[PDB]
Ligand binder design. Structure first.
Ligand SMILES: O=C(Cc1cncnc1)Nc1cccc(O[C@@H]2CC(=O)N2)c1
Ligand SMILES: O=C(Cc1cncnc1)Nc1cccc(O[C@@H]2CC(=O)N2)c1
Lengths: 304, 304
């Protein structure tokens, strides 16, 4: 029993974190095989950030200008290339702690763990979700860039995110491990504002199933609804529209609890229209949307 | 910017997790040097749990009855002893991944990270706090016993907790690494109920300082109060009484934000007497008490 915002064990990813210094800028890099991945804004001075032309700035850089340090030993850079918004610094040594890995581009609504790092050293790990507006609500300070988001499938690390930016609103923007930003963000110090932060409805439902599994059932009502009726209410509350794909995805939780998805939607609908009335669900006074249906099944079964 | 419930990187502790099997019971063990630590209820059958006499049950056990497995290799048990509610299984091999470590007994209010494990394999990491009633609100299933709580000071792991029990109310009980339970709990399947779960006031204040540092200032009012006046209100709301020691501990956060501790207490007092009014502080609709003043300073500065 008990439901926590659980992050994946970070050891496999700690063994991949290095420090990348280019001139005065020091940020984090991911060392997998003989390549070090890091944000391309490592080559910028805070001034360059206003209107950077990365191909022009990159000409002035040689292999010896990138200082890669793993722990306390210096890595030799034998090649460098730009792939979208990440730099790939080919080193002469393959990372002996390189785990089995993949580079995946996740969809909004999906959750992942972030190992926050500074000077190539991990300082904390937390669970995140790619918001529907392609921002993340991380916890990052200056020097955190190059910190990565990942999922673990048994022994394989699926790297999905690398931190690049903090918007003026305190939310974060970053890329996949191919350098492509999630959303419309660019690595430039210009006016970038995030869109509406809608609630991930399927994740709220999965978390409501987790609450029923854990004993908190006060919110279960005597009502049902339809996908169209629920969506009318969901749109009014800036919730993501719910599809038959999401209903199907909730199938295992619906089967385990004996509560049909549309019944749980009707419970959600009353919670939206009436609030919690000072009550809490899983120690939370708001509707939590950072657990996917897969996360609830993993945490409620013990997927190692 | 951004404030997350951050857990310490778990790698150093993952390298210490092993599986301990005694008859039909399989749980987790901590392998540090040539010793494996685990809950003593590993020797019990679910029946024995009702009224166990561990010294009597232990006589029937030999070194060869404890099966210790690290990853996929079997460890040889050359000695076994009971220390309070933990078994120490001396193995013939020192753990090559033993980090620099200490066994500390934390006080209620203090926070720590938990690496939840099953069959000696870590499956998740999350941040906890030792509740003032000596329970923890973890996320543990059957087979999680022997999962440990720790803090990391640069490269040294201070192990503070080992999971042993789940009370009928869904809260968790466990010991320090010397086998002594936090609180009045015993490793017996009998009626054990937790006391009042009071809120850790100093942690709420530290989290209010974190909110001001992160931009959420709506709750800052034009009032002040006294330690006695605040405590009158705190006791009414099942908050822990606030001492000059806690005020002193909040000193660095008070200095960084320019908000005196008693002013922040008056802000807390209005939040208690009036609720959030549908507002949120750091994305939370309730007053969070699982960040110590030290955690806020660590997260807001980047202590690796
Ligand atoms: O924010 C950081 C660094 C950092 C990261 N995380 C927390 N704190 C700091 N990097 C950065 C890089 C490039 C552009 C930029 O400005 C964009 C323009 C806009 O609206 N924000 C920012
Ligand atoms: O609860 C577990 C195992 C487990 C751990 N965590 C989640 N789920 C299961 N162990 C256990 C061991 C000894 C006594 C016991 O019962 C005490 C009596 C009472 O009120 N509870 C329980």
């Amino acid at each position: 029993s008990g439901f926590r915002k659980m992050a994946f064990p970070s050891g496999k990813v700690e063994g991949c974190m290095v420090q990348v210094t280019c001139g005065t800028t020091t940020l984090n890099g991911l060392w997998l095989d003989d390549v070090v991945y890091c944000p391309r804004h490592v080559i910028c001075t805070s001034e360059d950030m206003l209107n950077p032309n990365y191909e022009d700035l990159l000409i002035r850089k040689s292999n010896h200008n990138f200082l890669v340090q793993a722990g306390n030993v210096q890595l030799r850079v034998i090649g460098h290339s730009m792939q979208n918004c990440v730099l790939k610094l080919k080193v002469d040594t393959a990372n002996p702690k390189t785990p089995k890995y993949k580079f995946v581009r996740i969809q909004p609504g999906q959750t992942f763990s972030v190992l926050a790092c500074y000077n190539g050293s991990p300082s904390g790990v937390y669970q995140c979700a790619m918001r529907p507006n392609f921002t993340i609500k991380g916890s990052f300070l200056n020097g955190s860039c190059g910190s990565v988001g990942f999922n673990i499938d048994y022994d394989c690390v699926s790297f999905c995110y690398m931190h690049h930016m903090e918007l003026p609103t305190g939310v974060h923007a970053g890329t996949d491990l191919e350098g492509n930003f999630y959303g419309p963000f660019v690595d430039r110090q210009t006016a970038q504002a995030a869109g509406t932060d809608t609630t991930i409805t399927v994740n709220v439902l999965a978390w409501l199933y987790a609450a029923v599994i854990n004993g908190d059932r006060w919110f279960l009502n005597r009502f049902t609804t339809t996908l169209n009726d629920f969506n009318l209410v969901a749109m009014k509350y800036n919730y993501e529209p719910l599809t038959q794909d999401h209903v199907d995805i909730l199938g295992p939780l619906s089967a385990q609890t004996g509560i049909a998805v549309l019944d749980m939607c009707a419970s959600l609908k009353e919670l939206l229209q009436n609030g919690m009335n000072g009550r809490t669900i899983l120690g939370s006074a708001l509707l939590e949307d950072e657990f996917t249906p897969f996360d609830v099944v993993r945490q409620c079964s013990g997927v190692t």
